Design a protein around this ligand. Structure first.
Ligand SMILES: NC(=O)c1ccc[n+]([C@@H]2O[C@H](COP(=O)([O-])OP(=O)(O)OC[C@H]3O[C@@H](n4cnc5c(N)ncnc54)[C@H](O)[C@@H]3O)[C@@H](O)[C@H]2O)c1
Ligand SMILES: Nc1ncnc2c1ncn2[C@@H]1O[C@H](COP(=O)(O)OP(=O)(O)OP(=O)(O)O)[C@@H](O)[C@H]1O
Ligand SMILES: Nc1ncnc2c1ncn2[C@@H]1O[C@H](COP(=O)(O)OP(=O)(O)OP(=O)(O)O)[C@@H](O)[C@H]1O
Ligand SMILES: Nc1ncnc2c1ncn2[C@@H]1O[C@H](COP(=O)(O)OP(=O)(O)OP(=O)(O)O)[C@@H](O)[C@H]1O
Ligand SMILES: O=c1[nH]cnc2c1ncn2[C@@H]1O[C@H](COP(=O)(O)O)[C@@H](O)[C@H]1O
Ligand SMILES: O=c1[nH]cnc2c1ncn2[C@@H]1O[C@H](COP(=O)(O)O)[C@@H](O)[C@H]1O
Lengths: 482, 131, 79, 89
């Protein structure tokens, strides 16, 4: 016989202290498997399941189409922000939805009546010159030829003659519309050319492959796809009247999941918006606005949401608590809301205040199905914005959607700052996945479902931390370190 | 005493106060007594406690004297505070301060304590720099 | 049915911890009105009522006639 | 040319100046058909280019047999270290 050690989650939160992630730890269990065996499949809504629990926040310094595609390939998902025009957002969603691996998205095309000056200008303003030529100058018409650097390079500078310079169609090496990457590899290996146009039965250009892109091909066994094998995308929407048109455009673009974006989701406005979406687009998945309380969650679950976003005041760029006196400590809020919502089969996203891999593991163990990150994913290459240098260190802008800059008397609810560069999402995310798998292995859970069920049965055990313990848990007692 | 933010005002009104008095928040406004002055290129005004030695001109000092950065005009600053208070009341679900206090006395209004970690998490954290 | 969350004020202060404003928060409720509808009328004394709860402190670096007039116009008062 | 160096080194420097031509390569890198694609990869890694002609004896002044470049080497499997002749005839 061995007596029990530690606290259950129910005992941990019974004191009503106002705990956050840094106020406790999980106690280790028994190890009988390896960390790579740990399964990370996560419910996002009633209907959508992912293989990874990570989500990119719908902020205008975090998620556009590039971040969304990278997240979906890595196994998560992105939500497109709506601090922009409805047409712009719909175009971003379209770019995510029509992405293909190894193919060019929105090729540049020209007509034979264009000039070599047009090719030179395209090179100057886009960075490439392998531009196919079509009868009408655009996709969906008979292919006539292609022009590249080695066709343009030895001409005299005074020359501005028209194309057709252009190699004829009879000389082109093309493939039918049903190309697969293996056939593309064979064709390009045989032909040695830099482009591989893809045409219709009557020579209508519909797709094109670049050799440089194909050389960099990789495998994504965890990619988030819908039935049509297209990547999954999400979008943010508000609760006003102008958001009806935005919903129409995004639905035409083929968006998969919508999140209603607000700081306090328990309102007649959001309830009416949820009812309208469910009436008009009964196929669409809707995640309800931010709540921190079970009474908040009840109204939106009655309204008919498929998911809940949980958090208020916890985010890194947030001052809402200081300005409004409203919110909740995030660990407590996640535990309470997830405990209530799992009664109805509604998953929750833990959104805000995640700064480490251990915070992610804690959020998943307190009952969340997915985790949303703004600051951790900021300053990656896929993040919107151009890098900049300040004292010799690369930085990117990172601002809250309640900042004054993002609102262009208005009360500011956020701040704007900068985050150091972190590389590519496709390198950063597998690091997080490995950290999560290691935490699950140390705990003794071989999947996140088993982790949450261990928490709800009382098998999982926790300990609180004093400030001294928190200091002792970090780096201490060194002259210097790196 | 001790009001430093709009959230403090909302908290004081919800804990049962009928009015709130501010010294430091209203200091360094144009309507405040005293002439501005510059120290390292930032406009400042004198702000001192009535128990300071300067304000008493053996006497025991019960206050200190310092400076506050300029804040503009009261007629611009006060509507900002009013808007913040109205937003806090709306987030809570009270359409008047009387309804707020009555909700507090009936038990409808609900509160949570904060640890030091929660207080740190409630502020600006995890940024290289911000403004 | 939904169980209650949080503490009442009476429960909040029963422990006798010595709490200040930064030691707690208020939990959000239900929204069915706009922020500009919120009424701020405040009793100052048994007899005097204001439309704003803000008051300027009677300190010699805060309130003279100018501050007092501005506060009264904005809807508060100065001492 | 300075002479804080070996006489052979200085003579080689003078030879490089004297045999320079405009638009031509000076001292091309060459290989024999019995070399491996690993040799081409190493030449790329340690010189910066891969457009290396192939000659019977592996050096200048003998029958030319072919040429190997990036688009000849690029789609081969990494485990592959097979000999040239890959090489276009
Ligand atoms: N949860 C958090 O931690 C948090 C906190 C603050 C801000 N934010 C984010 O910053 C941004 C700010 O959003 P917000 O809180 O201003 O949202 P919001 O637009 O809902 O709030 C602005 C105000 O407009 C009102 N409003 C909204 N729809 C209305 C309608 N149809 N009719 C009348 N009034 C209406 C709201 O009640 C509120 O008072 C969002 O991106 C939000 O997600 C998040
Ligand atoms: N027609 C095109 N439409 C869109 N993107 C293109 C097109 N051609 C090239 N690109 C993009 O430019 C990248 C670099 O081009 P790549 O090196 O394949 O050849 P290129 O266009 O001939 O370039 P260069 O002009 O430098 O020789 C490709 O990976 C692709 O993403
Ligand atoms: N699919 C193709 N079929 C036939 N010819 C092609 C094809 N793609 C490119 N070419 C032709 O090959 C020649 C070389 O161009 P290619 O696109 O292969 O490289 P490039 O980008 O011009 O050269 P570099 O790589 O040196 O920058 C040109 O005459 C071009 O029109
Ligand atoms: N066989 C060679 N011998 C010596 N120098 C060479 C040789 N091939 C290329 N170089 C040098 O390398 C430079 C760059 O090579 P270039 O771009 O012409 O083609 P490449 O060798 O096929 O390069 P890459 O491997 O990058 O495609 C040339 O300008 C030349 O100075
Ligand atoms: O302007 C703001 N003020 C307060 N909270 C915000 C603001 N903008 C975004 N948020 C929230 O903070 C989250 C960002 O998480 P974080 O940056 O990782 O802590 C977002 O997903 C929103 O839930
Ligand atoms: O000299 C002093 N010593 C201690 N308290 C003072 C003194 N002067 C004013 N006070 C109090 O502090 C309040 C100022 O509030 P505050 O500056 O906003 O925190 C005044 O209204 C007085 O109640």
């Amino acid at each position: 016989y061995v007596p029990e050690d530690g606290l259950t989650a129910q005992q941990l939160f019974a004191s009503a202290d106002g705990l956050t992630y840094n106020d406790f730890l999980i106690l280790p269990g028994f190890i009988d498997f390896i960390a790579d065996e740990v399964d990370l499949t996560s419910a996002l809504t009633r209907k959508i399941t992912l293989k990874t629990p990570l989500i990119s926040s719908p902020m205008d310094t975090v998620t556009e189409a590039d971040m969304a595609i990278a997240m979906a390939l890595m196994g998560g998902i992105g939500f497109i922000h709506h601090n922009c025009t409805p047409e712009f957002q719909a175009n971003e969603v379209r770019k995510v939805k029509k992405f293909e691996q190894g193919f060019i998205t929105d090729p540049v095309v020209l007509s034979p009546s264009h000039t070599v000056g047009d090719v030179l200008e395209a090179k100057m303003r886009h960075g490439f010159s392998g531009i196919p030529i079509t009868e009408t100058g655009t996709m969906g018409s008979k292919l006539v030829g292609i022009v590249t650097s080695r066709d343009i390079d030895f001409l005299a500078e005074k020359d501005h003659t028209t194309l057709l310079v252009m190699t004829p169609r009879i000389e082109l090496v093309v493939a039918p519309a049903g190309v697969t990457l293996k056939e593309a590899n064979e064709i390009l290996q045989r032909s040695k050319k830099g482009k591989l146009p893809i045409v219709n039965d009557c020579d209508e250009l519909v797709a094109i492959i670049a050799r440089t892109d194909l050389k960099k091909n990789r495998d994504y066994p965890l990619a988030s796809k819908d039935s049509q094998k297209q990547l999954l995308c999400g979008a943010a929407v508000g609760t006003r009247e102008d958001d009806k048109y935005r919903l129409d455009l995004l639905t035409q673009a083929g968006v998969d999941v919508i999140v209603l974006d607000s700081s306090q989701g328990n309102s007649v406005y959001q309830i009416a918006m949820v009812h309208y979406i469910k009436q008009k687009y009964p196929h669409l998945q809707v995640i309800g606005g931010n709540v921190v309380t079970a009474a908040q969650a009840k109204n939106l679950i009655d309204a008919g949401v498929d998911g809940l976003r949980v958090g208020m005041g916890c985010g890194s760029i947030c001052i809402t608590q200081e300005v409004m006196a409203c919110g909740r400590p995030q660990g407590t809020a996640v535990y309470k809301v997830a405990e209530y919502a799992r009664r109805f089969g509604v998953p929750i996203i833990a959104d805000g205040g995640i700064q480490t891999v251990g915070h992610v593991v804690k959020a998943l163990a307190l009952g969340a199905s997915t985790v949303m990150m703004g600051s951790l994913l900021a300053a990656t290459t896929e993040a919107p914005g151009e890098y900049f240098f300040s004292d010799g260190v690369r930085l990117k802008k990172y601002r809250g959607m309640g900042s004054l800059d993002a609102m262009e008397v208005k009360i500011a609810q956020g701040v704007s700052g900068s985050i150091q560069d972190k590389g590519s999402i496709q390198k950063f995310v597998p690091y997080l996945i490995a950290g999560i798998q290691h935490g699950c292995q140390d705990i003794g859970a071989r999947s996140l479902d088993v982790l949450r069920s261990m928490m709800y049965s009382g098998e999982l055990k926790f300990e609180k931390r004093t400030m001294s313990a928190q200091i002792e848990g970090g780096v201490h007692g060194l002259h210097s370190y790196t």
